[PDB]
Paper text:
[name]-[name]-2 utilizes a trimeric [name] for attachment to the host cell receptor angiotensin-converting enzyme 2 ([name]) and for the subsequent cell entry step which involves the fusion of host cell and viral membranes. Given the rapidly changing mutational and antigenic landscape of the [name]-[name]-2 spike protein, a structural understanding of spike protein mutational effects and the discovery of broadly neutralizing epitopes is of importance.
To identify structural mutational impacts on [name] binding we next determined the cryo-EM structures of variant spike-[name] complexes. Focus-refined structures of the [name]-[name] interface enabled visualization of [name] mutations, revealing local structures which are identical to our previously reported structures using spikes harboring variant [name] mutations alone. These structural findings confirm that mutations outside of the [name] do not modulate the positioning of [name]-contacting residues at the receptor interface via allosteric mechanisms.
Author numbering:
A (entry chain B): 330 to 530
B (entry chain E): 19 to 614
Amino acid sequence: PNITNLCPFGEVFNATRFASVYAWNRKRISNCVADYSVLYNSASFSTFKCYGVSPTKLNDLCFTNVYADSFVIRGDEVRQIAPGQTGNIADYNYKLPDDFTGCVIAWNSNNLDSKVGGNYNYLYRLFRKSNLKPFERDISTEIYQAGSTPCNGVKGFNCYFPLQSYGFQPTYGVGYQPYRVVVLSFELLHAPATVCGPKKS
Amino acid sequence: STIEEQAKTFLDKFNHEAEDLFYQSSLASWNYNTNITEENVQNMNNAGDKWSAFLKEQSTLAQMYPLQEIQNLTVKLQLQALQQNGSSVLSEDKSKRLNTILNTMSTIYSTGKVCNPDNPQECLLLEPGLNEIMANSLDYNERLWAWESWRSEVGKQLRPLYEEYVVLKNEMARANHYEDYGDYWRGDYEVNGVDGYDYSRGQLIEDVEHTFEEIKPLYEHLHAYVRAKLMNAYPSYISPIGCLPAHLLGDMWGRFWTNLYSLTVPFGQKPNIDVTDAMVDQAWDAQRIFKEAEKFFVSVGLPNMTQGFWENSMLTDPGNVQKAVCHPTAWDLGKGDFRILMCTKVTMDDFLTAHHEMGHIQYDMAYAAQPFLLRNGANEGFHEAVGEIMSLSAATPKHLKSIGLLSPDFQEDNETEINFLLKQALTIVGTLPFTYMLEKWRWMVFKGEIPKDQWMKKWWEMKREIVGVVEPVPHDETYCDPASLFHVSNDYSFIRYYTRTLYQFQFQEALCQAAKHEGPLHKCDISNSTEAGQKLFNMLRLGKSEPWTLALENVVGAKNMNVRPLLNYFEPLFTWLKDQNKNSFVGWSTDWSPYA
Ligand SMILES: *[C@@H]1O[C@H](CO)[C@@H](O)[C@H](O)[C@H]1NC(C)=O
Ligand SMILES: *[C@@H]1O[C@H](CO)[C@@H](O)[C@H](O)[C@H]1NC(C)=O
Ligand SMILES: *[C@@H]1O[C@H](CO)[C@@H](O)[C@H](O)[C@H]1NC(C)=O
Ligand SMILES: *[C@@H]1O[C@H](CO)[C@@H](O)[C@H](O)[C@H]1NC(C)=O
Ligand SMILES: *[C@@H]1O[C@H](CO)[C@@H](O)[C@H](O)[C@H]1NC(C)=O
Ligand SMILES: *[C@@H]1O[C@H](CO)[C@@H](O)[C@H](O)[C@H]1NC(C)=O
Ligand SMILES: *[C@@H]1O[C@H](CO)[C@@H](O)[C@H](O)[C@H]1NC(C)=O
């Protein structure tokens, strides 16, 4: 029939500001029609790597919920947003499961997220005692203890601050320029699946 | 937990904050260099002070991790680099005195203006004018006047300053567990902890003497030929049995002999390989020069330049309103930002310089994967050597014919190869005894082998013994003749040029053997060879992570610097010089036979 109530992909992809990789935004998308061909056929995305499903049949399948995680990382750190990878972003900031079904979409945002003085509004967690579990968020700002001495809240010897900024400047290399990453997570649960694709009449 | 993990986390935090601060400092320096304005000077000074203060604080914090409890070689290398006190071990009064002495020597050298007595209404500075006078004049007394007046003013100003400088630097070096400041400079080549690939600070002097002993016959024949030609140019001043007069070498100090090519040309009747007119006829812009250089680097298999390189580099002089430093410099600003600052003209020299600086950029790009404190050459020689090999390859007639800059019907006979090799010898071979003598003299000054009252009596004695160059008139100890040069007056190591010159030809033989070149070494071009680029990039990607001996093993298959590729390069010229020196006498006498 006539299709309305499109999924809010405008408020994720076309957002005026994105979250940091550590405090990554998660938006739960439910009870609407998700048109994935609009995203796939765009020429504005540099990475559209889908794991566990192919983009062509996304426009047909139906899912219970869609999780849209949005954050900003470096150019060289896009490869770490994948199942089974390693690096500071995967170990300490945003971890994807090995049995992940969804798509990783990344695009260059040097135009918006870089200023000449240096944009220090985007941060990344550089240290933590253990690696993150899949789909875990750590927003703690407690001083990392690398040594035997207790930190006691002061960033002295062997005690460093976990979150470090990426000083994004427009004149950076392509491996250091800011990239906005949206990860779509598709799960099927025993509840009635309501995020379906558009149906032809 | 353990000390090694603590050092690794400390290095990670250091690297992260250091890269950003080094970027800010480098960007401020770039904005000063492309735009000379007082606010840019202030911004550069502020960024440099922040960078230096940050290095002081991290050096203060890095020493608390003992070196012997760390087993990972890369972590130990970064910690060794960071834990150097530098001047910080010295007292605050002496550190301030040393900094003041360095700054005032920089101002005296940069703003030194000398002109003829009785005509003082206007005077000439060394870089705008005295260089041109030394490089182009054919008058004996004019060059003698310029040479003696500049060494009189500069040496009489700099002699007490250098006397304080040697004592302060020796105090700092012995406070830093070195024998002298010469040992501190030789510590760049020191490799410790690697089985078999260890190199000692004391081995450097022995290796330099051992290589120079093999350099000496070729230099003797070249010196005899230059002596005969200068005797033709100046009839009565030069003796057949004696040394060359100091002020006739074509440069201010004798650093290069490349300004004597007009006087000492073997075959003037034959044409030159100048391609300047060909680029002028085809309207080659500086952008086209750099694009052809990029085509050369993609032909060998190296990565091409980034978009940010083309957007952010200044490859042309900006104009009258905006002032910029004209010296060609390759900038690795950090964070994948690579730029070239060159005021490129349409000349062969600028084209070769473009190849040289893009080679510097390629070397900088290759070790971008490395941690920040390991982002350098394995030694000070490799960084210049990898640009000089591109300068060697681009200058060949095969490269010029391939890119269309030289006529396809240009006849490559033996005479043009002889005169080209002689020009390359005047640039390259002529600097080797001067470099070795200067570094050996500075090492003996720092070591205390030469007392302060005998600095010049030994120095000229060294110059007659090694360089074969005699002083025009005797100089007493009120003169400071070495410190008239840029590198020595501004606290720079000078053995990098000697090591660069030998590494240049070692790399050239290795890449030409890789590229399966079947002719003479000077006729070899490394374009179109993927394997040569791969062999180069294997060393290029390492940076300072591995010892320079291991990097040299990676390229040439030898664990030490070698002199045979240079001698192999100039072998046609060596045979020609031996043929031309039958009547004349090779070698010189240390007596005062020409003039004193
Ligand atoms: C985001 O902005 C682009 C640029 O105009 C537009 O083409 C696109 O439709 C917008 N929405 C999405 C979901 O990409
Ligand atoms: C150079 O500095 C002047 C100082 O007034 C400034 O106006 C100009 O924009 C600068 N040029 C560039 C290319 O940065
Ligand atoms: C040394 O540390 C680096 C990381 O800093 C690591 O990649 C390398 O494997 C380590 N080497 C050894 C021998 O443990
Ligand atoms: C640096 O100087 C301090 C001050 O004496 C000293 O304790 C430390 O051992 C020095 N570091 C090195 C590497 O010599
Ligand atoms: C470098 O080469 C790649 C592949 O040949 C090309 O896609 C890229 O556009 C080149 N870089 C520039 C700045 O043109
Ligand atoms: C160049 O070659 C010709 C013929 O082989 C010979 O006569 C001439 O002497 C050679 N000249 C030099 C400088 O080798
Ligand atoms: C290198 O390859 C290019 C591309 O075919 C070719 O035009 C050029 O002539 C080659 N260089 C030489 C020296 O043959």
